[PDB]
Structure formats: C-alpha cells, structure tokens
PDB file of C-alpha atoms in Angstrom:
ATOM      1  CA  UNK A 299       0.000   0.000   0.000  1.00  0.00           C
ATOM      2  CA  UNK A 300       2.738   2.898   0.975  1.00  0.00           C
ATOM      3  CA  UNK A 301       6.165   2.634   1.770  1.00  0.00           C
ATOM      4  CA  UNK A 302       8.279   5.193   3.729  1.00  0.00           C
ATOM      5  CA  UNK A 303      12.383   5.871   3.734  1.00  0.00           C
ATOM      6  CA  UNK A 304      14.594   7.159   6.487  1.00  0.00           C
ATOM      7  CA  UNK A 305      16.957  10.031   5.940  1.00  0.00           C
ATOM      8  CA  UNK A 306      19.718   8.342   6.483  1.00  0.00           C
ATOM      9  CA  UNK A 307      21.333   5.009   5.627  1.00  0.00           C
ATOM     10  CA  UNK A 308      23.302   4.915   8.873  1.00  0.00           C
ATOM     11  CA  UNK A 309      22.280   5.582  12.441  1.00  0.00           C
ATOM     12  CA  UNK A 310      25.363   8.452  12.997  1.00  0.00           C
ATOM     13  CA  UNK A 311      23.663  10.206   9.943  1.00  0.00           C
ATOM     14  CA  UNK A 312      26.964  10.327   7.650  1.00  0.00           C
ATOM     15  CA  UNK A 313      25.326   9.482   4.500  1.00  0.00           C
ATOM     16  CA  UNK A 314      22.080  10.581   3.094  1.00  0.00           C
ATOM     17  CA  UNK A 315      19.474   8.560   1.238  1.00  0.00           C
ATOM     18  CA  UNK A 316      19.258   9.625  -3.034  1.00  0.00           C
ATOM     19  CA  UNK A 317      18.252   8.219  -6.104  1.00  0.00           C
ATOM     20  CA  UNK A 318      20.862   9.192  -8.136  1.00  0.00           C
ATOM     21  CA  UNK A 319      21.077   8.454 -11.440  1.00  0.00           C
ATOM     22  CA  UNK A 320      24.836   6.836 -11.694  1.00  0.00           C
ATOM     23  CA  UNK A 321      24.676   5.997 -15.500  1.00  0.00           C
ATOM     24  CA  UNK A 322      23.854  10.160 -15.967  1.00  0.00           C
ATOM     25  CA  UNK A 323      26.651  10.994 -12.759  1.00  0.00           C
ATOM     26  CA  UNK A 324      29.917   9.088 -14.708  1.00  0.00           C
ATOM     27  CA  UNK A 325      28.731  10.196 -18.460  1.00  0.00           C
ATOM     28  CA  UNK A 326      28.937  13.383 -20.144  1.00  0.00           C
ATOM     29  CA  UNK A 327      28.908  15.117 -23.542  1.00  0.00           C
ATOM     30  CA  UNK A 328      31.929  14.130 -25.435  1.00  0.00           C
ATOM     31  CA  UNK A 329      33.948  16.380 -27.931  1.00  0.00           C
ATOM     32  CA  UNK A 330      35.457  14.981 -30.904  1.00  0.00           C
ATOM     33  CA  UNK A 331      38.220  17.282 -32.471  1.00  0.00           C
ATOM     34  CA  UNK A 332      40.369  16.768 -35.499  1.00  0.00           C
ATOM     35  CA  UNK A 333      43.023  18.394 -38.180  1.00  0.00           C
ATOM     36  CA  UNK A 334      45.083  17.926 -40.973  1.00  0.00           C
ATOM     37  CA  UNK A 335      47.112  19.447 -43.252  1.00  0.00           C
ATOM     38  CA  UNK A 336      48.566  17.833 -45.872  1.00  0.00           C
ATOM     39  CA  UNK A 337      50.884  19.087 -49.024  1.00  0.00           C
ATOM     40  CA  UNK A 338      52.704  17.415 -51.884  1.00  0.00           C
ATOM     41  CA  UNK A 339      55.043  17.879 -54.949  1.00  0.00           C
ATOM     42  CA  UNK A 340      56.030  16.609 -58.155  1.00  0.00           C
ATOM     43  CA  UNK A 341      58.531  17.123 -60.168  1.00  0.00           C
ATOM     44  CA  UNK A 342      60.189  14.826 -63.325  1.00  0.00           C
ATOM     45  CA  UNK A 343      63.710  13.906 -60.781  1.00  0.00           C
ATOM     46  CA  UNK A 344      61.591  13.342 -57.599  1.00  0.00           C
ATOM     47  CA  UNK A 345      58.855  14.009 -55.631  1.00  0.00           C
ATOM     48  CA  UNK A 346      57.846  14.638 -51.775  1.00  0.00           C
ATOM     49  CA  UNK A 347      55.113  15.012 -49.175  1.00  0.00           C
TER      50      UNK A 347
ATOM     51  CA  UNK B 299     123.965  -3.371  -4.551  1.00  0.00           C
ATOM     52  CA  UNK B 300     120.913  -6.941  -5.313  1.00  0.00           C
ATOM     53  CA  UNK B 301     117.085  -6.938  -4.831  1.00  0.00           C
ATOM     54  CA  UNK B 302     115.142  -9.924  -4.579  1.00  0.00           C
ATOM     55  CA  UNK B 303     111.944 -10.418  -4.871  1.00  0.00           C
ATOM     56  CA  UNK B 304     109.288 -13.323  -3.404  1.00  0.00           C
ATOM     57  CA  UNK B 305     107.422 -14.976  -6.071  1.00  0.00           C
ATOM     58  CA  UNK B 306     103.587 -14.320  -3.810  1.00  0.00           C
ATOM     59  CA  UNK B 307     102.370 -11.796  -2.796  1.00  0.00           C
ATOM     60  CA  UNK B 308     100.539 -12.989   0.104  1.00  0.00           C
ATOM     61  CA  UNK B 309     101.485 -16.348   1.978  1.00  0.00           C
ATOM     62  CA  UNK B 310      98.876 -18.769   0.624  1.00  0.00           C
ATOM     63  CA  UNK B 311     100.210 -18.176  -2.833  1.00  0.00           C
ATOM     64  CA  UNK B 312      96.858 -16.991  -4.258  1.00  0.00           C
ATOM     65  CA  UNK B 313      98.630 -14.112  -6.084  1.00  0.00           C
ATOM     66  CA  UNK B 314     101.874 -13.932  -8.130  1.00  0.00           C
ATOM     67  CA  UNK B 315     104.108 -11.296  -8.584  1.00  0.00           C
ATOM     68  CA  UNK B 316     104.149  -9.467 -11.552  1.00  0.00           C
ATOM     69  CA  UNK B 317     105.437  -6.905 -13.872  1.00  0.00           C
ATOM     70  CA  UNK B 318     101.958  -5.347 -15.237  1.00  0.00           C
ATOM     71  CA  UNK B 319     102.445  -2.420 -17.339  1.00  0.00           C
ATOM     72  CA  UNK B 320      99.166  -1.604 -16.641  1.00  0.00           C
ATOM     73  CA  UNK B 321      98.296   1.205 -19.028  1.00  0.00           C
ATOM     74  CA  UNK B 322      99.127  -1.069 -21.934  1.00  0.00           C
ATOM     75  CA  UNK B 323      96.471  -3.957 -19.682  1.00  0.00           C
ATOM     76  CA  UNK B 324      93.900  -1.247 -20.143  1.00  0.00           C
ATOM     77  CA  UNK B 325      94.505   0.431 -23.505  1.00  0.00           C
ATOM     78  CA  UNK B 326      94.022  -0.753 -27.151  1.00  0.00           C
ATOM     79  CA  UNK B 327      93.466   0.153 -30.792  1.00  0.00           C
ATOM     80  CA  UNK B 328      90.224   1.857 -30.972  1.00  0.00           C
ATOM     81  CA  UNK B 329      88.671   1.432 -34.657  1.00  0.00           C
ATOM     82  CA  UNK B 330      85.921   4.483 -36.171  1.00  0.00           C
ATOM     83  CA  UNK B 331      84.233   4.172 -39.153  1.00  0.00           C
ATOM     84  CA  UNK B 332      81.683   6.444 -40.863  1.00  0.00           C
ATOM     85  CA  UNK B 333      79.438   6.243 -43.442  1.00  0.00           C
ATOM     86  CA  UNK B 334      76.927   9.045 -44.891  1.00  0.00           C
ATOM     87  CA  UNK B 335      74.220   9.054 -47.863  1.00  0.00           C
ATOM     88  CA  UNK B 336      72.701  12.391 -48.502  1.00  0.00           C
ATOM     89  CA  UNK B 337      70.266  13.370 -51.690  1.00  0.00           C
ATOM     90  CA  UNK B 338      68.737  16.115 -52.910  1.00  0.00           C
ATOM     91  CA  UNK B 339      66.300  17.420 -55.856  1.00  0.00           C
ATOM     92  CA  UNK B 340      64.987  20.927 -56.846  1.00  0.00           C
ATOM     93  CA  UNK B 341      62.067  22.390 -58.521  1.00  0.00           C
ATOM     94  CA  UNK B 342      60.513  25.390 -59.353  1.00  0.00           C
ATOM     95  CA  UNK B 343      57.562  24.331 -56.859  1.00  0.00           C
ATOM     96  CA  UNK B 344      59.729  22.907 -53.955  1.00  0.00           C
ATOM     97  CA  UNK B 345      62.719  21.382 -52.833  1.00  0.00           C
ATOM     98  CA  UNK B 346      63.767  18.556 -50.210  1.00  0.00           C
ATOM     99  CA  UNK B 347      66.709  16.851 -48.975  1.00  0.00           C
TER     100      UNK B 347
END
C-alpha cells in the first residue's frame, strides 16, 4: 500500500538517502576534435610530401 | 747493490708477482668508421633533402 524511507542510511547520519542516477553521474557530452594538413610535390627527378 | 723479490704476494700463494704495465692492460686500438648518404632534388615548386 505505501512505503516510507529514512533520511539516512546509517544511524550516525553520515550518508544521506538519493536516487541518483549513476549511469547520468559518470557520463557526459563528449567532444570529438580533429586536423590535418597535408601538401605534396612533383617534379620529373623526384617528388615529396 | 741486489734486490730480490718473493714470487707471492701474500702467503697462501693466491697471487703472483708481476710486472703489469698496466696502461698497456687497459689500452688498445680503438677502430671508427663512418658512413653518410645524402640526396637532394629541386624544382621550381619545392625542394627537399
């Protein structure tokens, strides 16, 4: 029918009762970045890049 | 006018007398060698080496 939860999960009240969400608490947003030059020659004796 | 000398140095015998020259023991023909390749190749657009 009902159900009721104390405040605290010990008696000397050093840890309060949540619901935290832990998949949502260790993951975040991530940001991808990337760049890249790149620049070549050719000539008849050689060539480089 | 003589010197003698005993044939150990310690009495157990577990070390002869010599006549070390030392700095010839310790010293020996060194040997160097060197070898280099190097190329290179120009153009109107670029160069590299």
């Amino acid at each position: 029918y009902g159900m009721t939860l104390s405040k605290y999960l010990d008696s000397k009240n050093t840890m309060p009762v949540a619901d935290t969400d832990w998949f949502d608490e260790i993951t975040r947003t991530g940001v991808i970045q990337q760049y890249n030059l790149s620049v070549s020659n050719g000539s008849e004796k050689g060539s480089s890049f």
